[PDB]
Design an enzyme around this catalytic site. Structure first.
Site, PDB file in Angstrom:
ATOM      1  N   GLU A  65      12.290 -23.252  20.282  1.00 43.58           N
ATOM      2  CA  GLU A  65      12.116 -23.872  21.588  1.00 43.58           C
ATOM      3  C   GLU A  65      11.316 -25.162  21.457  1.00 43.58           C
ATOM      4  OE1 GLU A  65      13.147 -23.318  24.627  1.00 43.58           O
ATOM      5  OE2 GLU A  65      11.674 -24.219  25.983  1.00 43.58           O
ATOM      6  N   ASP A  93      13.995 -18.592  21.289  1.00 40.75           N
ATOM      7  CA  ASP A  93      12.800 -19.429  21.301  1.00 40.75           C
ATOM      8  C   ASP A  93      12.103 -19.499  19.950  1.00 40.75           C
ATOM      9  OD1 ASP A  93      12.315 -17.977  24.496  1.00 40.75           O
ATOM     10  OD2 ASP A  93      12.965 -20.044  24.131  1.00 40.75           O
ATOM     11  N   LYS A 119      17.882 -10.390  31.253  1.00 42.10           N
ATOM     12  CA  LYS A 119      17.799 -11.014  29.937  1.00 42.10           C
ATOM     13  C   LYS A 119      18.534 -10.202  28.880  1.00 42.10           C
TER      14      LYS A 119
HETATM   15  O1  LIG Z   1      16.209 -21.570  26.809  1.00 34.80           O
HETATM   16  C1  LIG Z   1      16.495 -21.507  28.004  1.00 34.80           C
HETATM   17  N1  LIG Z   1      17.401 -22.287  28.590  1.00 34.80           N
HETATM   18  C2  LIG Z   1      18.108 -23.344  27.883  1.00 34.80           C
HETATM   19  C3  LIG Z   1      17.754 -24.715  28.401  1.00 34.80           C
HETATM   20  O2  LIG Z   1      18.096 -24.769  29.788  1.00 34.80           O
HETATM   21  C4  LIG Z   1      17.636 -25.822  30.530  1.00 34.80           C
HETATM   22  C5  LIG Z   1      17.968 -25.906  31.874  1.00 34.80           C
HETATM   23  C6  LIG Z   1      17.499 -26.969  32.625  1.00 34.80           C
HETATM   24  C7  LIG Z   1      16.710 -27.939  32.053  1.00 34.80           C
HETATM   25  C8  LIG Z   1      16.382 -27.852  30.722  1.00 34.80           C
HETATM   26  C9  LIG Z   1      16.838 -26.797  29.950  1.00 34.80           C
HETATM   27  C10 LIG Z   1      15.798 -20.527  28.909  1.00 34.80           C
HETATM   28  N2  LIG Z   1      16.234 -20.430  30.173  1.00 34.80           N
HETATM   29  C11 LIG Z   1      15.632 -19.577  31.004  1.00 34.80           C
HETATM   30  C12 LIG Z   1      16.135 -19.490  32.431  1.00 34.80           C
HETATM   31  C13 LIG Z   1      16.837 -18.165  32.768  1.00 34.80           C
HETATM   32  C14 LIG Z   1      18.243 -18.423  32.249  1.00 34.80           C
HETATM   33  C15 LIG Z   1      18.522 -19.804  32.797  1.00 34.80           C
HETATM   34  N3  LIG Z   1      17.204 -20.455  32.759  1.00 34.80           N
HETATM   35  C16 LIG Z   1      17.036 -21.764  33.017  1.00 34.80           C
HETATM   36  O3  LIG Z   1      17.840 -22.343  33.741  1.00 34.80           O
HETATM   37  C17 LIG Z   1      15.855 -22.501  32.435  1.00 34.80           C
HETATM   38  C18 LIG Z   1      14.693 -22.686  33.401  1.00 34.80           C
HETATM   39  C19 LIG Z   1      13.516 -21.781  33.121  1.00 34.80           C
HETATM   40  C20 LIG Z   1      13.096 -20.822  34.040  1.00 34.80           C
HETATM   41  C21 LIG Z   1      12.016 -19.997  33.788  1.00 34.80           C
HETATM   42  C22 LIG Z   1      11.324 -20.113  32.605  1.00 34.80           C
HETATM   43  C23 LIG Z   1      11.708 -21.046  31.676  1.00 34.80           C
HETATM   44  C24 LIG Z   1      12.790 -21.870  31.934  1.00 34.80           C
HETATM   45 CL1  LIG Z   1      13.226 -23.039  30.711  1.00 34.80          CL
HETATM   46  N4  LIG Z   1      14.591 -18.798  30.574  1.00 34.80           N
HETATM   47  C25 LIG Z   1      14.125 -18.869  29.278  1.00 34.80           C
HETATM   48  O4  LIG Z   1      13.181 -18.150  28.921  1.00 34.80           O
HETATM   49  C26 LIG Z   1      14.768 -19.772  28.435  1.00 34.80           C
HETATM   50  O5  LIG Z   1      14.309 -19.837  27.177  1.00 34.80           O
HETATM   51 MN   LIG Z   2      12.844 -18.018  26.551  1.00 37.00          MN
HETATM   52 MN   LIG Z   3      14.691 -21.326  25.187  1.00 36.20          MN
END
Ligand SMILES: O=C(NCCOc1ccccc1)c1nc([C@@H]2CCCN2C(=O)CCc2ccccc2Cl)[nH]c(=O)c1O
Ligand SMILES: [Mn+2]
Ligand SMILES: [Mn+2]
Length: 180
Positions: A65, A93, A119
């Site tokens: 990450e 991550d 998840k």
């Molecule tokens: O890696 C992840 N997403 C890939 C990048 O997505 C982006 C999307 C937009 C901009 C920039 C990046 C990731 N996403 C998630 C979550 C739930 C599934 C969709 N979600 C997201 O929309 C990311 C927003 C978010 C929410 C809460 C905590 C952390 C985050 Cl970052 N929760 C993770 O814990 C994780 O690691």
């Molecule tokens: Mn995560």
């Molecule tokens: Mn991530």
């Protein structure tokens, strides 16, 4: 433009975190100046991921990450091609060199049960390890194996609650809790 939440994020998190989250949002075509609750969310996720990897020994964790998408998958390919671990469907991550598993760390404002299930069903990757923290202090990990020592996860929980209070003291917590 010009939200209180955006100015709070820049003052609450350290500059390297803010810039990595800004890069991340813009890479996925999102604006930290308008989608400000998300902006706060990835900063929190980033800082938690970095504290997590600080809890192991020197060479325990590979940090996935915070990279740009192409380089994050490059390191995952090399990890898989040297450990024989299955290639995860979505970017995790961290990678645990000690226990030989990818870690997906979660930070949720709802109860821990619901987020883990989403998840897990949305992972479907049988091999990865899943670890959730909440803004109230609850945690749950796959097979009840929380990987790190009690003190390292405890200070993660302490920091998450401090973030909650500073948000609440600025009347921003109500908006952030209903964003997720
Ligand atoms: O890696 C992840 N997403 C890939 C990048 O997505 C982006 C999307 C937009 C901009 C920039 C990046 C990731 N996403 C998630 C979550 C739930 C599934 C969709 N979600 C997201 O929309 C990311 C927003 C978010 C929410 C809460 C905590 C952390 C985050 Cl970052 N929760 C993770 O814990 C994780 O690691
Ligand atoms: Mn995560
Ligand atoms: Mn991530």
């Amino acid at each position: 433009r010009g939200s209180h939440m955006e100015d709070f994020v820049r003052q609450c998190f350290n500059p390297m975190i803010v810039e990595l989250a800004e890069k991340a949002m813009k890479e996925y075509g999102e604006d930290p100046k308008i989608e400000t609750n998300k902006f706060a969310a990835i900063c929190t996720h980033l800082e938690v991921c970095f504290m997590y990897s600080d809890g192991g020994s020197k060479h325990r964790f590979e940090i996935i990450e915070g990279r740009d998408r192409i380089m994050a998958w490059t390191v995952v390919n090399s990890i898989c091609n040297t450990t024989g671990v299955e290639k995860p469907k979505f970017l995790p991550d961290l990678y645990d060199y000690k226990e030989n598993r990818f870690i997906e760390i979660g930070v949720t404002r709802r109860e821990v049960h619901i987020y883990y299930l989403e998840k897990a069903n949305k992972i479907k990757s049988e091999k990865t390890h899943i670890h959730i923290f909440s803004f109230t202090g609850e945690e749950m990990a796959t097979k009840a194996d929380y990987t790190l020592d009690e003190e390292s996860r405890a200070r993660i929980k302490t920091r998450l609650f401090t973030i909650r209070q500073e948000m609440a003291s600025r009347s921003l917590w109500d908006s952030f809790r209903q964003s997720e």
